[PDB]
């Protein structure tokens, strides 16, 4: 076969990829985000409360 | 600075305690002066019971 070949392989991998990716790759490194925006916002927190 | 903000405000709220009562402490010492005055003059006005 010339071209038809590959239309089964790659459909099964996709998916298999984007759901294990979601389940056990993206979500412990996405977290960081929300943390190390977090350490800027305590600490600009901290210079308005020893003002007040 | 945070942390040294609070030493420093807490010099403050200790002068602020002693300066109080050292307020406090001088009128009480001002009311028994002016007690004190009071008897001494009401002694010397005494002279009546040869003056008058």
């Known amino acids: ?52 | 600075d945070l942390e040294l903000a609070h030493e420093k405000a807490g010099q403050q709220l200790r002068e602020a305690k002693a300066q109080a009562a050292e307020i406090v402490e001088q009128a009480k010492k001002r009311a028994n002066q002016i007690v004190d005055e009071a008897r001494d003059q009401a002694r010397t006005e005494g002279e009546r019971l040869k003056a008058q």
Do not use: H, Y
Not at chain 1, 12 to 40: D, S, T, Y
Not at chain 1, 44 to 50: H, I, P, T
């Open chain 1, 1 to 52: 076969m010339n071209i038809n070949a590959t239309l089964i392989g790659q459909s099964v991998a996709f998916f298999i990829f984007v759901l294990f990716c979601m389940k056990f790759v993206w979500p412990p490194v996405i977290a960081a985000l929300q943390e190390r925006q977090k350490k800027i916002a305590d600490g600009l927190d901290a210079a308005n409360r020893a003002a007040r």
